[PDB]
Structure formats: C-alpha cells, structure tokens
C-alpha cells in the first residue's frame, strides 16, 4: 500500500523477552508511505534506530506517539499495542 | 531499555536458513545474552537482550563467522 | 508452533554458551530465552521442533537436560 493507515497494518513480528518489561507500543517504518519494517518499542522512552541512510534518535510519549528527525521520504509511526 | 538490560537489533545474512541459524547460535553463545529472537517484517534481524553486550564487537564477530551484519537499533 | 522449556544443569558459563548455541542453531526456532536464578532453563519457541531430539542433543553436548514443558 501507499497511504499510511496504522488501523489496517498487520501486527509486527515480536518477542516479548522475559527478562525485561513488555513494551507498550508497535512502531512501523515507511519509505514513500510504503511499509519497510515494524516492531515493538516502549512508551515514554527513547531509542536509536537506523532509518534509511541515517541513525535517528526516536522519542516516544505516554501515548506511543514517536518523534525524530527522519531523512527525506522516511517516517516511523507508533501506536498502542492491544491491552495497553 | 528501562532497567539494567540492553536491547539491540542486528540485521543478519539471509544466504540460507542454516546461515541465519549460525547467526542465531553465535549471538545466543555470547556472554551476557539473556534472549534472542528473529524479528523484522522479513525475519532477517536478531533482537538480543542482555547486559554487558558489546554491540560493535558482536557485529564484527557476525561478519567474521557468518556473513554481513548491520546494527539497526539500540534501546 | 510450540513453546518448549528445558532445564540444563550448568557447570559454568561455557555450559550456558554451548546450550544456548545448540538450541538457537535448531531448525524452526523463533526465539530462545535463558531464564532462572542460575540461568539454566531454556525457553524455545518455534515450528517443527522435536523436543525429545533437542533434549537428547543437550544431554550429549552439555549435561542431563530435563524436559519441563511442551505447549
């Protein structure tokens, strides 16, 4: 697809590792509005992720909204996992 | 991630199922690793959780033993 | 898809490394977690894994592996 709609995106592949808290969010990475990858991440947290050509520091708020300086054509978007 | 554990994600070579399994074995074998999982939309990445893991040393070890590897996430 | 849990008595971190490498190398594996106070229980999730053969391989390579769960 080429219009982002997180309500219709299939859940990412994930593993809720037993040694750590269960992350609250799913993230989805797009290039030209085309899904490239997806996974889990913590709410109210931060991560460094390779987004196309760049390392990007991505912050999450309490509602799984993500912020970062994404390279042209790319975006990473969050949403709450079921039960969160 | 929150607390004392590290989570990183490394893209591993997809030459074959056996190659991907060799990468899994190398990471799982590494000191201070608690858990490993195949992740990514194409199941081409290893997510590893533990403490005292040297992500850059692990990339180098995967490139030596298995095939090309790329760090993609630290959290 | 199944979740298999095996206890592998560990003499050292060399034992843990060998056991984790063997399990993670197994065809059909999605995830491996080393759990327990003594990091001596292995949780493996995946498809088409022969739990008895995996216990036999651990008994040969490492130590007296014990099957705890297959679900």
Residue numbers in the entry:
A (entry chain C): 30 to 113
B (entry chain B): 184 to 258
C (entry chain A): 188 to 258
Structure paper excerpt:
One example is rice Pik-1 that comprises an integrated heavy metal-associated (HMA) domain. In the K-type pair, Pik-1 acts as a sensor that binds the AVR-Pik effector via the Pik-1-integrated HMA domain, whereas Pik-2 is required for activation of immune response upon effector recognition. RGA5 and Pik-1 detect three unrelated effectors from the rice blast fungus, Magnaporthe oryzae, AVR-Pia/AVR1-CO39 and AVR-Pik, respectively, via their integrated heavy metal-associated (HMA) domains. Functional characterisation of a resurrected ancestral HMA (ancHMA), dating back to early Oryza evolution, revealed that different allelic variants of Pik-1, Pikp-1 and Pikm-1, convergently evolved from the weakly binding ancestral state towards high-affinity binding and recognition of the AVR-PikD effector through different biochemical paths.
To interpret this model from a structural perspective, we attempted to determine crystal structures of the ancHMA domains in complexes with AVR-PikD. Crystallisation screens of the heterologously expressed proteins resulted in crystals of the ancHMALVKIE–AVR-PikD complex, which diffracted to 1.32 Å resolution. The structure revealed an overall architecture of the complex similar to that of previously published co-structures of Pik-HMAs and AVR-PikD. We note that the MKANK/EMVKE and IAQVV/LVKIE regions map to two of the three interaction interfaces previously described to underpin binding of AVR-PikD, and other AVR-Pik variants, to Pik-HMAs. Among tested constructs, only the Pikp-1:ancHMALVKIE chimera associated with the effector at levels similar to Pikp-1. This indicates that the polymorphic residues in the IAQVV/LVKIE region are critical for the evolution of enhanced AVR-PikD binding in Pikp-1. AncHMALVKIE formed the strongest interaction with AVR-PikD at levels similar to Pikp-HMA, followed by ancHMALAKIE, then ancHMALAQVV, ancHMALAKIV, and ancHMA, which showed weaker interactions; we did not record any significant binding for ancHMALAKVV. These results indicate that the two most recent mutations, Ala-222-Val and Val-230-Glu, collectively referred to as AV-VE, determined HMA transition towards high-affinity AVR-PikD binding. Close inspection of these structures revealed that the Val-230-Glu (V230E) substitution enhances the interaction with AVR-PikD through hydrogen bond formation with His-46. This bond is formed by Glu-230 (E-230) of ancHMALVKIE but absent in Pikm-HMA and ancHMA, which carry Val-230 (V-230) at the structurally equivalent position. We concluded that this shift is consistent with different stoichiometries of the ancHMA–AVR-PikD complexes; while ancHMALVKIE–AVR-PikD formed a two-to-one complex, the constructs with the extension interacted with the effector at a one-to-one ratio.
